[PDB]
RNA sequence: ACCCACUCGGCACCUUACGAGAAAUCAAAGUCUUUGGGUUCUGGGGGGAGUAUGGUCGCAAGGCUGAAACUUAAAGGAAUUGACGGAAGGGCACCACCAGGAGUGGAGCCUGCGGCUUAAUUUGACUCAACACGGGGAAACUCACCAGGUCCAGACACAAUAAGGAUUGACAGAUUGAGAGCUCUUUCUUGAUUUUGUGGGUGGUGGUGCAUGGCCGUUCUUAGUUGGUGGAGUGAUUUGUCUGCUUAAUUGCGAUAACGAACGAGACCUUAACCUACUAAAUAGUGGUGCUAGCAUUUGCUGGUUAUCCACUUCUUAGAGGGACUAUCGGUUUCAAGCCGAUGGAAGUUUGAGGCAAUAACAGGUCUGUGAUGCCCUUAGACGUUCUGGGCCGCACGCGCGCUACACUGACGGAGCCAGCGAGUCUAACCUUGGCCGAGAGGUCUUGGUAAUCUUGUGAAACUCCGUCGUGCUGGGGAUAGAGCAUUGUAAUUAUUGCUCUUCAACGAGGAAUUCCUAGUAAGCGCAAGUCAUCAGCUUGCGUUGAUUACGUCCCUGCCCUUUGUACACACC
């Protein structure tokens, strides 16, 4: 998919030797968190903000200013 | 593949012949020098270059061929 | 006779496993390096071989006893994971079938393949996954093939020749297809650039895709791959990754010695749909106004006018947003994931269609895309290259993709008259409107455009309407062939293509077979783009007209999955 275009660089290189040639194929996948100028995460990613304990009750009452 | 055939007769090349040449020019009894063979009135060939003597034919070789002066 | 409890001794099963084992497994195969209850028998790597020999028993066939030489690095056991089967159980799919549509298979031609022919008819590829494929529509070129002619563009090093010239070129004639000084005659020219030899290079559409890279196709219209902590196992391993249900999906639910995750699917991206909300526009358009034509006249109706001005953004353009999450409701389901129906909605089949796409495999195709490349071959009487000419088109015939037809839901003739995706000329001749001339093809003079500006509203074709014909190989059909005219091109003969007249074939719905397809789809219909000097019956996209039939299954076929067997693991070639 699309994240491929966004996050992985590839290169093929032909390395000519005494016997024949070999194909080097390099693939690098870069930290998307660091994206900088694009999307900062995979389309996959789904973060939930973590609530907060509450200490409720305290029967009514009102503040004045 | 197939290899070879030939109803024969291979073609050769050329030679530039021999000739200890430019004897042509003649100097009299000490020491006046007269040119044999006439030279070229083309601006390109400042009259050092001569004309070969055939028949009808006098011809400038320096002009790689160029021009047909006839006397 | 039957039931309950007990107990000796039987044939067995069940669950455990403290314990054993290399494991499979085992209440003995336990009580074994913490090694001793009694006793009997047999084995000491594989083959050679239960062979030779002697003894013995037998009527015999044979039985018992039973060697060595020599050969050899493994043979063997159990389990694991793969791979594979002409074993079994499940699934998925219009490259499967059901219900059907439109066909192909029959005909004419077009075009590839075989075959034959040939100087040559260059060549790759042969089930799906070779054959309108190599973007492969070849007149030269391309081009590799064939008949023949030039050239070196043979780096460099050493040696040799050699300034008394190493070498170079050529006018005319001869030659030659040729205005190739190819060679020859002849005799000027040139000046250390070459020549000759060896060494070494260099080019090659020469060989090897079974030496390679890269790319691509296929498996795959598939759903699979892995690691952390836990559990099992001495171990390779396994569980997680599973009976079921569910999904297009190892997509999920659920079950659960597993829990929680990552690659792949999904997400993501592109394009088609919806925004009287946002920002705008003489390279897009609308309303008002002026200038103005025509028809009515009573306002009116229908046009002209890239700026005569004013305002707008519904339509067009493209930025930014918004929108859908199978929403609401209800059926159904283990009331789970889901599935179904109704309403709403631009939109509810993964929204439609694509792009991307893991792990692994193949001796799939490509050395003929590459100045990617190993090795082999070849290298001046070239397999380098170029030039002239022919050839890839050759035709008893087999095969594939196609085009056009057999007519009356039609052909012909008037007339109506509507798309979308494209593309176009600088140091050049591309897209072409308009005016004339021409039956046509085309010609000619001008013209706008490097483009939302001009071609172009690309006035496309099927289609619609009024006529002619009237079922007759007919006015359906347009093969084959003759004559003439033009266009591209240096060149049109074997006829590039276009036009006119004439000639008027087979084909009366196509055997056995076989392809493709579920909605703006199928089928019909044209167009633009690729190729392109010229040539589309091909492709790639595009819009126009627009259905019948399923919404299911495992019968055929194909494939994945379990279970199972394996003496395979280079893995059933
Ligand atoms: Mg995806
Ligand atoms: Mg002289
Ligand atoms: Mg056990
Ligand atoms: Mg035990
Ligand atoms: Mg017991
Ligand atoms: Mg032994
Ligand atoms: Mg023996
Ligand atoms: Mg005996
Ligand atoms: Mg005996
Ligand atoms: Mg007897
Ligand atoms: Mg014995
Ligand atoms: Mg014996
Ligand atoms: Mg031995
Ligand atoms: Mg096994
Ligand atoms: Mg059927
Ligand atoms: Mg049929
Ligand atoms: Mg060839
Ligand atoms: Mg296939
Ligand atoms: Mg040629
Ligand atoms: Mg030459
Ligand atoms: Mg040499
Ligand atoms: Mg050599
Ligand atoms: Mg080559
Ligand atoms: Mg291969
Ligand atoms: Mg390869
Ligand atoms: Mg081959
Ligand atoms: Mg399908
Ligand atoms: Mg499994
Ligand atoms: Mg695993
Ligand atoms: Mg799938
Ligand atoms: Mg009025
Ligand atoms: Mg009025
Ligand atoms: Mg708008
Ligand atoms: Mg509705
Ligand atoms: Mg979409
Ligand atoms: Mg092969
Ligand atoms: Mg290649
Ligand atoms: Mg080669
Ligand atoms: Mg190429
Ligand atoms: Mg390359
Ligand atoms: Mg060659
Ligand atoms: Mg051909
Ligand atoms: Mg064939
Ligand atoms: Mg095909
Ligand atoms: Mg008509
Ligand atoms: Mg005329
Ligand atoms: Mg102009
Ligand atoms: Mg338009
Ligand atoms: Mg008839
Ligand atoms: Mg007709
Ligand atoms: Mg011709
Ligand atoms: Mg021919
Ligand atoms: Mg007729
Ligand atoms: Mg029919
Ligand atoms: Mg052509
Ligand atoms: Mg075209
Ligand atoms: Mg083609
Ligand atoms: Mg067995
Ligand atoms: Zn001269």
Curated annotation (Swiss-Prot), chain A:
Gene Ontology terms: cellular component: 90S preribosome; cytoplasm; cytosol; cytosolic small ribosomal subunit; nucleus; preribosome, small subunit precursor
Gene Ontology terms, MF aspect: DNA-(apurinic or apyrimidinic site) endonuclease activity; RNA binding; structural constituent of ribosome
Post-translational changes noted in the entry: Ubiquitinated at Lys-52 in response to stalled ribosomes. Ubiquitination leads to activation of the No-Go Decay (NGD) pathway and degradation of non-functional 18S rRNA: first monoubiquitinated at Lys-52 by MAG2, followed by formation of 'Lys-63'-linked polyubiquitin chains on monoubiquitin by HEL2 and RSP5.
Cross-link (Glycyl lysine isopeptide (Lys-Gly) (interchain with G-Cter in ubiquitin)): 40, 52
Annotated compartments: Cytoplasm
Keyword Iron-sulfur attributed: no
Phosphoserine modifications at: 61
GO biological process: cytoplasmic translation; maintenance of translational fidelity; nonfunctional rRNA decay; ribosomal small subunit export from nucleus; ribosomal subunit export from nucleus
Keywords tagged on the record: Cytoplasm, Isopeptide bond, Methylation, Phosphoprotein, Ribonucleoprotein, Ribosomal protein, RNA-binding, Ubl conjugation
Assembly: Component of the small ribosomal subunit (SSU). Mature yeast ribosomes consist of a small (40S) and a large (60S) subunit. The 40S small subunit contains 1 molecule of ribosomal RNA (18S rRNA) and 33 different proteins (encoded by 57 genes). The large 60S subunit contains 3 rRNA molecules (25S, 5.8S and 5S rRNA) and 46 different proteins (encoded by 81 genes).
Reported function: Component of the ribosome, a large ribonucleoprotein complex responsible for the synthesis of proteins in the cell. The small ribosomal subunit (SSU) binds messenger RNAs (mRNAs) and translates the encoded message by selecting cognate aminoacyl-transfer RNA (tRNA) molecules. The large subunit (LSU) contains the ribosomal catalytic site termed the peptidyl transferase center (PTC), which catalyzes the formation of peptide bonds, thereby polymerizing the amino acids delivered by tRNAs into a polypeptide chain.
Additional detail: Present with 146000 molecules/cell in log phase SD medium.
Family of the protein in this entry: Belongs to the universal ribosomal protein uS3 family.
Protein name in the entry: Small ribosomal subunit protein uS3
Taxonomic lineage: Eukaryota, Fungi, Dikarya, Ascomycota, Saccharomycotina
Part of the full-length chain shown: 161 to 225 of 240
UniProtKB/Swiss-Prot annotation, chain B:
Zinc finger (C4-type): 40-63
Localization, UniProt: Cytoplasm
Superkingdom classification of source: Eukaryota
Transmembrane region(s): none
Positions bearing Phosphoserine: 41
Cross-link (Glycyl lysine isopeptide (Lys-Gly) (interchain with G-Cter in ubiquitin)): 26, 32
Biological function: Component of the ribosome, a large ribonucleoprotein complex responsible for the synthesis of proteins in the cell. The small ribosomal subunit (SSU) binds messenger RNAs (mRNAs) and translates the encoded message by selecting cognate aminoacyl-transfer RNA (tRNA) molecules. The large subunit (LSU) contains the ribosomal catalytic site termed the peptidyl transferase center (PTC), which catalyzes the formation of peptide bonds, thereby polymerizing the amino acids delivered by tRNAs into a polypeptide chain.
Complex and partners: Component of the small ribosomal subunit (SSU). Mature yeast ribosomes consist of a small (40S) and a large (60S) subunit. The 40S small subunit contains 1 molecule of ribosomal RNA (18S rRNA) and 33 different proteins (encoded by 57 genes). The large 60S subunit contains 3 rRNA molecules (25S, 5.8S and 5S rRNA) and 46 different proteins (encoded by 81 genes).
Name of the protein: Small ribosomal subunit protein eS31
Organism of origin: Saccharomyces cerevisiae (strain ATCC 204508 / S288c)
GN (gene name): RPS31
Span of the entire protein shown here: 82 to 152 of 152
């Amino acid at each position: 998919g699309q994240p491929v275009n966004d996050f992985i660089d590839t290169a093929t290189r032909h390395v000519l030797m005494r016997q024949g040639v070999l194909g080097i194929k390099v693939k690098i996948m870069r930290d998307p968190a660091k994206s900088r100028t694009g999307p900062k995460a995979l389309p996959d990613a789904v973060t939930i903000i973590e609530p907060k304990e509450e200490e409720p009750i305290l029967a009514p009452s009102v503040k004045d200013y | 593949x197939x290899x070879x055939x030939x109803x024969x007769x291979x073609x050769x090349x050329x030679x530039x012949x021999x000739x200890x040449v430019l004897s042509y020019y003649k100097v009299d009894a000490e020491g006046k020098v007269t040119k044999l063979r006439r030279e070229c009135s083309n601006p390109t060939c400042g009259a050092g270059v001569f004309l070969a003597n055939h028949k009808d034919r006098l011809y400038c070789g320096k002009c790689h061929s160029v021009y047909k002066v006839n006397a």
